[PDB]
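Entry type: protein chain
Record version: 2
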Amino acid sequence: AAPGKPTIAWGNTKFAIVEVDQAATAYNNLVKVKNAADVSVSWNLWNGDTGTTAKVLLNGKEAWSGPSTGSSGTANFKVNKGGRYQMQVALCNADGCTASDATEIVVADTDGSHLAPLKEPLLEKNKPYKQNSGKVVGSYFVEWGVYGRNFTVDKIPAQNLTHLLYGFIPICGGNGINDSLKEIEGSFQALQRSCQGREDFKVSIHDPFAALQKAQKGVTAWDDPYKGNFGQLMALKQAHPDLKILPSIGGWTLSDPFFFMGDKVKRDRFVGSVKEFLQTWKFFDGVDIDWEFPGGKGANPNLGSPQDGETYVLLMKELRAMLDQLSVETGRKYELTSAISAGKDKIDKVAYNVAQNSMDHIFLMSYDFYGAFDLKNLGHQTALNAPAWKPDTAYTTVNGVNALLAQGVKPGKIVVGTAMYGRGWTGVNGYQNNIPFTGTATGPVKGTWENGIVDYRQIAGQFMSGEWQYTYDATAEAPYVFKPSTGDLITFDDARSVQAKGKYVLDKQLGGLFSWEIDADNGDILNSMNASLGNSAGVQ
């Protein structure tokens, strides 16, 4: 007779191809990419003949076999593809094979193949849109937004985006390399910890706890290998396979390392680390480069060189070469994007007509034109056009688009930026003709999280009532609110100015719209981005 029916031993059933060390603060020690998960299974036989061969099956396919030598056994084997498997132990002899009941085993990998889809309901005012315009609809999600802002990946209105950018992946480096981080309490020291033992100019993760370990919806079990933002983003990719999730490298305080990449030793090390990063974190679909900015005038006053243009172009060419190689190794399409200044003063430091050939999308940062960093010269921070009181205004969206077009940039590359925040001043005074923007300010408006910057959610929730005036400037295509008694002036985007940008995108055959930052919207801005680009209401 065939062997008795084995009983699978209670034991760990959760395994990982990319292992995460739970007592490691250095990125080098935190993650270990294996070629396969090490899986183990044991069994007991409570009744009968133990057979002469034991086998471990996954969905009916042998993953291990060995001699059956008594009433309990253990098998150790490798599984090289993530997912959930129905695992059986079979005991076999010449008279037949007898299989256990199946036990599910989970084999984790960083494409999220082991995860249920994170398919969460739309919150606040977000309404469902189909991505059927063919236009980019992008937004940034910030790693640190899971703390005070309490805005986690399960709150992203992900069906209403084509592109989700993760801000920010840092480049390792200490003194003189990431000095802009020292303005933020503990930030520099947190990167040095993450980068311990890791070469400068390689990418890392700035806050490993937020990115990988913090419990979040869908990834709360202790032995779920990938938690935090990355584990939720993996589950999000399972829900939305065509969503492009891009790691963004740089931004205001993590851009200092780019200024050294005129040394090809450093640039080659960076590009190789990006390749390794995308081989490690398979849910990411390419890379976004947010170097602020070639030529300087970003956070650090001591960086910027005339060579930065050339470095920027080389960097894109080389990143594209790496991503093309990764693309044919994987069968996947990878994207290379960059967020760039929208001021023509900064645009003309780069040959974007050359760089565009390496790039899928240029995210034109048509915001922060004005703000509490200048108390003398007030203006619309994210307007389409100049206002009627100052028709020579330099920093407008159209002038940034026009500067790019004047270089030879194809219109379809350019994605226009929308702000899900306002910037503002207090004590605005000495203005003429009831236009507060012809005055001067005494300081920043009291912001939501930091001085001078207000979430759009708070503008709509608090500053569109009481004493606040609301004006839509139809020449500039820009809303603003003004409190006359405190001189508080806030300049932002609203549904109408976003609609004007989206119509302008369609008229000029531009690439789409993107936004900073997704946690600050209540739904009104992203709804308008979708509607104004021609996306059909509904779900597919």
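Comment: The first strand starts at residue 7 and ends at 8.
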